[PDB]
């Protein structure tokens, strides 16, 4: 057999059995009869669909918004470039003697830390950061934790 079937239980109850099938039809001898006839005729006579709308304005006025137009778009839709370009922050070269201890505590927090995360956390330029990062740590390129700078074994094995 199969050990799992993944059923979905629910609360169900049988509350009757059908005995007669009935069709409701308006009586032919009813005073209100032949109103349904008109309604049913209208069901087909009436048409839901409409026609296309034609612009009666001047063609030049209608085309003023097309192509190379003087007016500049004011829409804010899909403004990803604006959204991510507005934010921008830079940092100074604080002396190595402080960021070095900061990096040691960060490494103690975690032992395999990426370059983008390092730039974010230390908030330093890559040019200056690389010198100290190479001086203290090394990058594992072939190991399973590839692309992640890690402290050199000389100081890590302590």
């Amino acid at each position: 057999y199969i050990p799992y079937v993944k059923t979905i239980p629910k609360k169900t109850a049988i509350v009757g059995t059908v005995c007669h099938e009935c069709q409701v039809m308006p009586s032919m001898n009813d005073p209100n009869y032949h109103k349904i006839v008109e309604q049913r005729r209208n069901i087909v006579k009436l048409n839901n669909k409409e026609r296309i709308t034609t612009l009666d304005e001047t063609v030049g006025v209608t085309m003023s918004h097309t192509g190379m137009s003087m007016r500049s778009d004011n829409s804010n839709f899909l403004k990803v470039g604006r959204e991510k370009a507005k934010s921008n922050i830079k940092s100074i070269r604080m002396p190595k003697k402080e960021i070095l201890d900061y990096l040691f505590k960060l490494f103690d927090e975690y032992d395999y830390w990426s370059l983008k995360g390092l730039k974010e956390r230390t908030r330093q330029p890559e040019a200056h950061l690389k010198e100290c990062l190479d001086k203290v740590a090394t990058l594992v390129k072939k190991g399973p934790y590839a692309f992640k700078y890690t402290l050199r074994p000389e100081y890590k094995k302590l």
Binding site: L78, K79, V80, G81, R82, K84, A85
Partner: protein
């Protein structure tokens, strides 16, 4: 019964300028929508306006 006659004009249809332009416009509009989606993907990915 005999095999259906292929020349029976009742089983034939005449496509006027209406249906022809309809299908041509369908194809062209599908291409236009594809281009719109491509532009959306390009702007979202490459970070353009």
């Amino acid at each position: 019964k005999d095999q259906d006659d292929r020349d029976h004009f009742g089983k034939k249809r005449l496509d006027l300028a209406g249906p022809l332009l309809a299908q041509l416009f369908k194809t062209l509009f599908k291409k236009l929508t594809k281009d719109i989606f491509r532009y959306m993907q390009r702007t979202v990915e490459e970070a353009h306006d």
